[PDB]
Design a protein around this nucleic acid. Structure first.
Ligand SMILES: [Mg+2]
Ligand SMILES: [Mg+2]
Ligand SMILES: [Mg+2]
Length: 117
RNA sequence: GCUUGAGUCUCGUAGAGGGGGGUAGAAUUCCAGGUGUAGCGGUGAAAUGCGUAGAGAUCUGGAGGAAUACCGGUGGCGAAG
């Protein structure tokens, strides 16, 4: 076991799902939870409520580490991004800093074709 | 014969105009390794499909190909494309 001050939490917010993972600052995984794993299937999985419950599940799953003064980084355009940080605060974790990062390609390569619906 | 059309010379200016050779950084994919463990992905709603031979997530290194966020315009160049 270990007690980690200044651990890093990763938020990946797809349109269809949300993933929460806790790693040491060098990216070594400590614990992870998910909306789909929270007892959700299909369209329910994109709701911000699902993200909140997923964040609580992640926090509880990793309690055995003495994690304090958390840092949170968020990626993706999906919904419920803010809800996860609210959850980690509510879980009791102390949050020092918060950052956004999402890959931009600088016109790298071709995306799929437009959707006629 | 003439200098008003047309052309030559001297000095400057702007430009994604054209051909050849180098080089840069962001990103998708693949491969190796560490962390790690059971879902991911998708949709109107699903299923097909992918993962315990270790996926997805996250971190380190390597390979290859193609296009050049922002500036950027209500802009410029070209006989047209
Ligand atoms: Mg050129
Ligand atoms: Mg492998
Ligand atoms: Mg013109």
């Amino acid at each position: 076991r270990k007690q980690v001050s200044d651990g890093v939490a990763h938020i990946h917010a797809s349109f269809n799902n949300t993933i929460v993972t806790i790693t040491d600052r060098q990216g070594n995984a400590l614990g992870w939870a998910t909306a789909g794993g929270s007892g959700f299937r299909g369209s329910r999985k994109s709701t911000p409520f699902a993200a909140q419950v997923a964040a609580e599940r992640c926090a509880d799953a990793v309690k055995e580490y003495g994690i304090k003064n958390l840092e949170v980084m968020v990626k993706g355009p999906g919904p419920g991004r803010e809800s996860t940080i609210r959850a980690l605060n509510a879980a009791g974790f102390r949050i020092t800093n918060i950052t956004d990062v999402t890959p931009i390609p600088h016109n790298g390569c071709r995306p799929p074709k437009k959707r006629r619906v």
